[model samples]
Target: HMEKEADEARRQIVSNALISEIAGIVDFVAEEQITVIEQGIEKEITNPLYEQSSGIPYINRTTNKDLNSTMSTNASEFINWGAGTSTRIFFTRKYCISTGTQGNYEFSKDYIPCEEPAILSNSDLKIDRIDFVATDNTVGSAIERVDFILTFDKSNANESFYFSNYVSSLEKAAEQHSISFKDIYVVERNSSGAAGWRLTTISGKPLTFSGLSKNIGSLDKTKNYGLRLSIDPNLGKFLRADGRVGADKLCWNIDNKMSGPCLAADDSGNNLVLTKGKGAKSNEPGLCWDLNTGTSKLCLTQIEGKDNNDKDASLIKLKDDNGNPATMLANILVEEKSMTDSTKKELRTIPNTIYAAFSNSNASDLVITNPGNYIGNVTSEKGRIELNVQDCPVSPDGNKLHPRLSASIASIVADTKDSNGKYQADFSSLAGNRNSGGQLGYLSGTAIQVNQSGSKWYITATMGVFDPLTNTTYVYLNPKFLSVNITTWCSTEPQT
Candidate 1:
């Protein structure tokens, strides 16, 4: 029964299969009809379909037929479909081709070329054409050149045109980074297209330069002054150097070397030299004043006129301890008297007179009466008597008379000679009597008798008060009676 079934199936196959009339009908029938059909079924079963998961598998083509062209419309479709030929990686954007662990895939040299200003958003990207990479979190790579710009609205003005390396990673770490500049500028540009530059520091700190040379000008004429270099410690004081010479060395000084606060050329030993620059109005080269040294005592200053009628530049003159129009002198002397004495013996009618006397003369007579007399009696009395008395022994404005009479009377007593031609008693040894109570007084004694030897029948008479208060003896005699002869003299006072 099985044999019969096989024979019937064969017959069925032959009848269904095409019976070619060609010479090689048998091979043609096997190849085209049966074999080809068998191969198609095998291919359809084993070969990969147009799959999104399994990539296209390799297949050998027996004939130069459009085999792959009819392969699948499902998943294994490719414009370039063959062994040793790549499916063209048509990237609408940037991409990297890679494979699994078993094998590797390489990007074709004909892969898409990246254009300028490319942005790699998600992951890192490396290109051989460029020397850098787009890092994960970073924006750009270590590129040779970067064009950067910053802008602001700048408060309304409208539209304006305006406007490395090599870290072999380690080598760059050790190498010094240098910035080469084409032109470094601080520019200030305005709408008018004008520009300027100024050197200034950011904060309030000083902006210093090496050596500065400048020709500067002040707009305000009042402040049109020269360089003033000063060393003022703790404040604006001490040594000052204003570009002024002798007359103009105005603001130069040192600590206490001149005057207080602003030291000028005065007693203190500080002074300065002032000089005029090329911009000076006059030909005054230099004007120097010394507060410390030369002519320090002298002051040379501008003299203003008291009245408005005088000109502004009335004078610039030197002044001394006294100002101009002064009574300036070297020295003065007040000589008491001349060596020559006066013969006139009389109390000085004038006030405050000191007397000198000789024998037979009072201080007044010795000082004034005899102008041509020898000067033997004209000398200052050395002794001083301090009168400390309470009242006049016959008071005569004791305050006034003490100094006058003491010196006056002392003058007579000192130089006068006694009638016996002996040296008069030395008054300096006499102490003030304890009983003497006043400034003007007489010497007290027990009076007894008196006699004159060269009588010619001379009458002896003595009458005077002895003032024990001053320890002084006063005798008054009328000048007319002193020369009277006994025959011609008849005295009213009684004889002793």
Candidate 2:
């Protein structure tokens, strides 16, 4: 059975090389400072010097203007006077938004509850020893490219040095740490997808590319614990220290399938579309080419829904949200043609399902009474899904799961520092009704509900309680997504 690809853009990058380089640079800079001179001249810094400069030297001689000290340094080495010591290097590991919106993808950064503790945990991932898989593609598509930064450290570590010296020093350092240096293995390097192996420094720490992977893994996960593939001839593409490919460079570890490219993992909610080739025959196995002929070709295959014996299963709404009033909550579409004999040959085609729901909604504003077990489509004896969507109202008209009305019930927090940022309700002061759509509602002796016509905030206070409807999942669209949601108990307040 072929496993589906993980959602969104993700890849493993060892912070060790970056950290080591940063450490090296921090050492060089902590003890030294950048100088601006009118006469000193040094060799030009360009493509090859990118890694050390942290992209480019960003300096300011005037209060209101930004200057390219990196350029000036390239023009003249021996200078008269210049204040040029980097404070921090910002390396943005750009993960391209492939198919879904940036909001849909899960990021380790987003889940962090507290800053100090989160960053503290991040520190454990390390900067010296990094083992990961570099993939040719993420989610089955080729990655555009990744850009790394070499920053000057100020708060973390005091370091400063010329970009040129930084690069050369990195090369020498890699050779010195041959045994520990992360190796680079370039696969189809410079091909139209002209990717290559390169060395990068994060505050003078060294980052050597290891190799390319079939399934690119998430950076944080791989960087922290490393990856082990479960496929045959597991090959990896990586970058070496000194920006060179290794001798055995990147070879296929036939025995280690789970080493690189974490593509074969199980997916809970994935939308898979099927392909149709032939028609349905009278009483034969496999789908018909166009309704007349028959052939055996499976475009995509999904795990059969356990709840419903239909074409597809409904999306188990861990919690309720909103949706279009008239929209058909969910539907499961058959990908290929139906079996010819109808029952003679069992054509196991992939199950195609779609659940249209709102991206954001305060809990109770929308509710799916029963999401998992609800049946939508069942043509090929596959399955269907159930999802809920709703409109905003502080209090439900007829004792329904409604939205929040006043800020008094919850604390509204913004996603950013901006004054006009969206508001999300806090869970502590939160309390709500019992019957919005969700599974595992039984786990808690009591649950909060939303009043119709309430604000669009999320449900927070009831984190411990599981929904009875969707037994497996828990409440979603917490303060992060839902800005307005209310809580109410029948015993506490009379229903509106």
For this target, which candidate reaches the highest TM-score against the unseen true structure?
2
What lDDT would each prediction earn against the true structure? 0.23, 0.24
93-122: candidate 1 lDDT, tens digit per residue = 112422322212222221123221122111
TM-score of 2: 0.16
| Cα error, candidate 2, residue 424 (Å) | 87
Superpose all Cα atoms of candidate 2 onto the true structure and report the RMSD in Å to 1 decimal: 32.5
Off by over 4 Å in 1: 1-424, 430-496
TM-scores for every candidate against the unseen true structure: 0.13, 0.16
